[PDB]
Amino acid sequence: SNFQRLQEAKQRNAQVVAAYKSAQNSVSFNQQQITDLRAKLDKETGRLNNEKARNGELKRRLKQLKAGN
Amino acid sequence: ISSTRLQLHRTMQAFVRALNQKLNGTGISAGSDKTGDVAQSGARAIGGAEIGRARNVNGLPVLPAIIPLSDGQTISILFHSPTAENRITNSDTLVAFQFLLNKKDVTHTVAPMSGRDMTLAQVTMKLANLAEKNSAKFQRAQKKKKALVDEITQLQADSDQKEDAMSDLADQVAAVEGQKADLEQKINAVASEADSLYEENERLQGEIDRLNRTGGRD
């Protein structure tokens, strides 16, 4: 019978179009979120930079202080 | 009614001629396109019906006669031999009882038994009427079948093309996920380093103030 063929064709058609739409949106989504992650990493690196500079300056000042008793 | 071979052909051509003469008003006509074989001999009954190979239903002789009408319909009448047993042989009276139109049994209305007699004009007119009644739906059926073929082919091609397009998106997502995990690890490492360094700085600052309180041990 061709009627069962109609059934299977239309159900596979709907399935495939739904999959196509969702999979088409996924790429824009994941690009957005990877950009966000890059931004967070850069912010954290900036704070770490500041902390390292402070640590170096403070250690140098200590070594200046204690020398020669 | 008729012999197996000595009266069948003549009765069939006469029946076809009667059908043709009284089916004049309707565009449907009855006949056969078959013209013998490659050899071209005279005294040939070109116009008429066709006869099929004998079969046996439940131990009884069966002999068909197919009348292929125009417009795609057919009329078939069936003979059987009560006077003779075993094979049909030849020179043997035959009985016409079953009338079929488009493979559907229709003897039930064309040939009731009534008054222990029956004329042929009723039969001919009745078959003509049912043929011209049925032709409309018998013709729309083929169109709906062809439309079904065309539409299913188009739809299936659509689905295959779309799936071929779909294929690679999972792999794309997988690569994205790998990059995401790497970014998370990087962020965690940087944050841990920063907090540890802060604790170190606070301890050293406390020591610095404590030592400057006394002036570097004089």
Side-chain angles (χ1 to χ4, degrees):
Chain A
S1 169
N2 202 158
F3 151 90
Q4 313 145 358
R5 320 259 190 94
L6 301 183
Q7 268 87 67
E8 307 296 5
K10 81 206 185 272
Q11 60 75 48
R12 93 166 283 185
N13 184 83
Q15 173 56 85
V16 162
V17 312
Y20 197 108
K21 307 313 193 63
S22 76
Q24 216 172 350
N25 71 43
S26 181
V27 51
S28 311
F29 274 140
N30 53 31
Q31 194 70 359
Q32 181 55 28
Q33 25 175 35
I34 54 158
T35 50
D36 229 18
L37 302 207
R38 256 157 140 194
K40 283 180 80 164
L41 160 69
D42 273 9
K43 166 197 303 326
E44 202 56 0
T45 51
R47 272 320 149 202
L48 169 37
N49 178 356
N50 175 24
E51 216 71 12
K52 291 224 260 193
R54 217 196 75 143
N55 185 21
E57 297 171 60
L58 185 88
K59 254 201 294 293
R60 299 216 216 208
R61 232 97 176 187
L62 165 66
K63 313 332 181 273
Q64 179 155 0
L65 173 58
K66 60 198 164 182
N69 317 88
Chain B
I1 299 192
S2 268
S3 295
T4 81
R5 257 91 192 171
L6 302 185
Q7 192 53 285
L8 192 31
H9 205 312
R10 325 274 68 76
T11 48
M12 228 45 44
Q13 48 213 60
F15 204 51
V16 152
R17 268 211 141 173
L19 268 283
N20 197 351
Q21 274 313 339
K22 94 192 272 183
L23 201 42
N24 49 357
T26 289
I28 292 176
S29 156
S32 177
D33 280 333
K34 290 188 319 311
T35 87
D37 67 85
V38 310
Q40 214 159 2
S41 175
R44 50 173 201 291
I46 289 287
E50 39 206 41
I51 311 164
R53 150 87 178 159
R55 195 127 161 188
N56 294 313
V57 47
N58 39 47
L60 307 180
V62 201
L63 191 67
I66 311 281
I67 316 163
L69 322 182
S70 174
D71 182 82
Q73 287 191 4
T74 204
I75 289 188
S76 56
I77 74 166
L78 158 69
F79 287 13
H80 152 285
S81 170
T83 50
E85 203 57 41
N86 154 34
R87 197 130 161 181
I88 190 47
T89 83
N90 199 334
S91 67
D92 155 62
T93 89
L94 284 183
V95 159
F97 41 80
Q98 202 76 350
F99 295 158
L100 308 176
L101 168 133
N102 276 7
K103 185 163 181 223
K104 191 88 71 164
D105 202 284
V106 289
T107 301
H108 213 86
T109 325
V110 317
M113 60 155 187
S114 158
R116 309 291 101 82
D117 69 319
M118 191 145 158
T119 66
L120 59 143
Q122 203 303 310
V123 166
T124 63
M125 225 171 172
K126 175 43 141 163
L127 329 177
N129 293 7
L130 326 186
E132 63 78 35
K133 283 163 190 170
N134 279 29
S135 78
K137 41 188 201 309
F138 185 91
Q139 284 316 88
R140 66 184 271 204
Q142 285 81 245
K143 270 219 299 280
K144 80 204 273 173
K145 303 306 291 190
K146 196 247 176 201
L148 284 206
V149 178
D150 215 28
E151 58 83 25
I152 176 58
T153 321
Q154 265 180 39
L155 204 43
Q156 287 288 343
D158 160 5
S159 71
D160 321 330
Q161 158 81 329
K162 214 75 173 293
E163 283 281 29
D164 215 55
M166 187 302 298
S167 71
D168 56 357
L169 283 153
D171 322 274
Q172 265 171 329
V173 165
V176 159
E177 187 95 350
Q179 286 123 27
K180 295 183 132 228
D182 214 348
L183 262 300
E184 304 284 280
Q185 162 278 334
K186 217 150 292 182
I187 277 175
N188 285 350
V190 159
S192 77
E193 170 150 10
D195 59 57
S196 69
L197 188 85
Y198 182 104
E199 303 290 1
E200 183 88 39
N201 271 351
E202 87 80 10
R203 278 205 291 107
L204 193 65
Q205 173 58 89
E207 260 210 31
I208 273 287
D209 188 357
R210 202 200 53 72
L211 190 54
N212 192 12
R213 181 252 297 288
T214 84
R217 277 318 226 165
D218 198 8

